[PDB]
Amino acid sequence: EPTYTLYATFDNIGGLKARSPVSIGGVVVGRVADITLDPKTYLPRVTLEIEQRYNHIPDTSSLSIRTSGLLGEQYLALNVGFEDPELGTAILKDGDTIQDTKSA
Amino acid sequence: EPTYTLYATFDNIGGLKARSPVSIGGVVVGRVADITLDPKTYLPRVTLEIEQRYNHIPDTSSLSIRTSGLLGEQYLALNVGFEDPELGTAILKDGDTIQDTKSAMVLE
Amino acid sequence: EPTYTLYATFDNIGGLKARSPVSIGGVVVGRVADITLDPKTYLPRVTLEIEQRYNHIPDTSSLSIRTSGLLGEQYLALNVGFEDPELGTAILKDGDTIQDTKSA
Amino acid sequence: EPTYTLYATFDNIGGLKARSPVSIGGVVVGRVADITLDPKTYLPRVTLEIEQRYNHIPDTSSLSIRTSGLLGEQYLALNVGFEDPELGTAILKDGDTIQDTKSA
Amino acid sequence: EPTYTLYATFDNIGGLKARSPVSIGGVVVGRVADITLDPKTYLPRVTLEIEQRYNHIPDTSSLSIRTSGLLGEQYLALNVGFEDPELGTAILKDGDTIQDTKSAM
Amino acid sequence: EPTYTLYATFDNIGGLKARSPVSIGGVVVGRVADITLDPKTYLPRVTLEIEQRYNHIPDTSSLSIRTSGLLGEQYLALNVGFEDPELGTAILKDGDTIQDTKSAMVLE
Ligand SMILES: [Mg+2]
């Protein structure tokens, strides 16, 4: 699949690692590509590769670090946001940042 | 066994995958045949193959994503509904949608 | 061991499967032989094989689906009922149904 | 080691099985030898083999079914009883029954 | 390493076995050398070998049976006591008994 | 990677061992190199190797012993402190001590 890149900053990425899934309603739409520490904030910055076919995702969308069952692997849940039609189509594209994150 | 098809849309299908069981009172009556995420609604849509012998299931019946014990596999629980026969008899048939769905519950 | 057959209907048999134990105070007295869902009631019906040596079980006896510890297998707990001496001996025999069941 | 045999009835023996340890303050002093269901009471009946060197155990002593940690094996804890000296020395010997049990 | 011997009696040693660690603030300072059940008191008696370098531990120090995480091995935690020096300076030495013990949960 | 050394004293290091990670928001920035118990204070002293690229960590930063999930290994969490600009900028360098520590949390 061709993919596009999104960025997100979390206070804490817990057990999230590269190759961790990104899901929408529990369906895999992408992967964590990289995690590094922002030199300016010392907050972790995550790089996501989302599949190009999932490409009308509003900017108001949020990312949560979740675990699959009690003893499972960590993953990112993309919660697809409400978009006020009176404020256009603000859509996530290659290079954009998801502003709304939930850590730990 | 001959089967019939039902559809269901969830907000979140959690760890449900194709070939996941569909059960009534813990007895397997079907299989998840397909899961796709709708590119237009970003809601997951599940296709079920239910065995033809389980055939008088009211429309008011619900589907829940449950887990078998704490550390187990995810499955679909069909909770068989009520329709007052005196007020007309609405039954799930090949191609119908189950409207009442309960999504995977998370941490909290 | 020779066995006899008992039947029981539950709202929900959870993780119960064929070959699941039937126990009295945690001692194994039988096995689940079959589970079928009645198409007419949509209630699961369990067939049990109880060991012939445990053959003075009152009719008023009850079955519970329990789990063995936190992480364990599901089993059936036979709770041995009250036998009114003033009303004689009503005893479970090959083909009888245990009426009093507790699910999930 | 030579052993002596004690008997005990529980309402429920949970996960207890033959070869399960019997301990005093967490030290192994014997083994569960046998578990059966009493034909007369339908209560589980446990046979213990205590090492002969642990042989002045008062009859007021109790048995508890415990688990070793959350996810561990079930074992029997012998709690060594108070015996009023003014009412004699009543000691457990080969063949005796421990009357005070705690199940489940 | 040279070691010295301490004794301790518990009501219940739970899952403690010979070779079980003895730790101070989570650092291993010794080993359980022996466990016997006293046939006379039916109390378990634990023999410890503490490393000689850990050496001016007050008598008022306590031993606890703890578990390392939920699913872990049992160990002995030596909690180093206060002693007011003005009221005597009593130290655990080869052969001494730790009087203050806390038994398995 | 080149690393620099930091020291820290805890009341209790719990399950911390050599090669245990040091992390900042769950990203690994170093390793526990050594643990010794001071015979004089009976307080454990930890030696850390932090990667040289993480080198503007304020002195006011703190270390916590945490566990990764319910059943996981112990690690050190470096919580990056506040750096007052107005009175000048004190940074951890090879050989410095982290003063602010939080020990392994015990039975309830
Ligand atoms: Mg003591």
UniProtKB/Swiss-Prot annotation, chains A, C, D:
Instruction: Outline the segment boundaries, as ranges, of region: MCE/MlaD.
Output: 3-80
Gene of origin?
mlaD
Q: Which GO terms describe its molecular function?
A: phospholipid binding; phospholipid transfer activity
Q: Provide Periplasmic-side residue ranges.
A: 1-104
> How does the record describe its quaternary structure?
The complex is composed of two ATP-binding proteins (MlaF), two transmembrane proteins (MlaE), two cytoplasmic solute-binding proteins (MlaB) and six periplasmic solute-binding proteins (MlaD). Interacts with MlaC.
> Which keywords does UniProt give here?
Cell inner membrane, Cell membrane, Membrane, Signal-anchor, Transmembrane, Transmembrane helix, Transport
Q: Source species, please?
A: Escherichia coli (strain K12)
Keyword match Signal: no
Q: Which residues of the full protein are shown?
A: 37 to 140 of 183
Say which domain of life the source belongs to: Bacteria
GO cellular component terms attached to this protein's record: membrane; phospholipid-translocating ATPase complex; plasma membrane
Q: How is loss of this gene reflected in the phenotype of the organism?
A: Mutation leads to accumulation of phospholipid in the outer leaflet of the outer membrane and increased outer membrane permeability. It confers sensitivity to SDS-EDTA.
The entry sums up its family as follows: Belongs to the MlaD family.
Q: What is this protein called?
A: Intermembrane phospholipid transport system binding protein MlaD
Where does the record place it? Cell inner membrane
Q: What does this protein do?
A: Part of the ABC transporter complex MlaFEDB, which is involved in a phospholipid transport pathway that maintains lipid asymmetry in the outer membrane by retrograde trafficking of phospholipids from the outer membrane to the inner membrane. MlaD functions in substrate binding with strong affinity for phospholipids and modulates ATP hydrolytic activity of the complex.
One GO term under biological process is: intermembrane phospholipid transfer
Curated annotation (Swiss-Prot), chains B, F:
Query: Which keywords describe this protein according to UniProt?
Result: Cell inner membrane, Cell membrane, Membrane, Signal-anchor, Transmembrane, Transmembrane helix, Transport
Q: Where in the cell is it found?
A: Cell inner membrane
What the record says about disrupting the gene is: Mutation leads to accumulation of phospholipid in the outer leaflet of the outer membrane and increased outer membrane permeability. It confers sensitivity to SDS-EDTA.
What GO terms in the biological process aspect are recorded for it? intermembrane phospholipid transfer; phospholipid transport
Please list where the region (MCE/MlaD) is annotated: 3-80
Question: What coarse category fits the chief subcellular location reported for this protein?
Answer: membrane
Q: Which family does it belong to?
A: Belongs to the MlaD family.
| Assembly description | The complex is composed of two ATP-binding proteins (MlaF), two transmembrane proteins (MlaE), two cytoplasmic solute-binding proteins (MlaB) and six periplasmic solute-binding proteins (MlaD). Interacts with MlaC.
Its domain description in UniProt is: Forms hexameric rings with a central hydrophobic pore via its periplasmic domain, which also binds phospholipids. Contains at least four binding sites.
Q: What is this protein called?
A: Intermembrane phospholipid transport system binding protein MlaD
The organism named in the record is Escherichia coli (strain K12)
Q: Where the shown chain sits in the full protein?
A: 37 to 144 of 183
